[PDB]
């Protein structure tokens, strides 16, 4: 969030409108990675083995 804010404060205004699609998708991609749950050496139970 700081990067988008830094660019706006600097006066670029490049991300206004459709340009905003980049930060939005990144935030979604970040959410997906940290939400996969536990997959370990003891926590072996997963779709490929069940």
């Amino acid at each position: 969030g700081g990067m988008v804010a830094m660019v706006f404060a600097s006066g670029s205004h490049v991300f206004g409108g459709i340009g905003s699609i980049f930060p939005l998708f990144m935030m979604v991609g970040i959410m997906m990675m940290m939400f996969r749950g536990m997959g370990g050496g003891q926590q072996q139970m997963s779709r490929p083995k069940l």
Binding site: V14, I18, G19, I21, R47, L50
Partner: protein
């Protein structure tokens, strides 16, 4: 009987149903249930890869529009 209506559900039941759906789908086209190899999974995934590649190129085109636009006349 049991199971009717819009009751609650869990994540283990959702995968359980997808397993029966794939296995019965195989029985209609191959008439056998051994499933040592599961080709339905693979054939579906190939389409998902295709769609992903089309969208990735799609984002690549939008990125160049801002880097080197057509409006730079004069």
């Amino acid at each position: 009987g049991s199971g009717y209506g819009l009751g609650l559900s869990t994540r283990t039941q959702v995968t359980g149903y997808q397993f029966l759906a794939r296995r019965t789908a195989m029985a209609l086209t191959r008439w056998r249930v051994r499933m040592e190899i599961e080709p339905g999974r693979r054939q579906t995934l190939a389409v998902v890869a295709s769609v992903s590649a089309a969208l990735v190129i799609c984002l690549g085109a939008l990125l160049w529009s801002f880097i080197s636009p057509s409006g730079q006349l004069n």
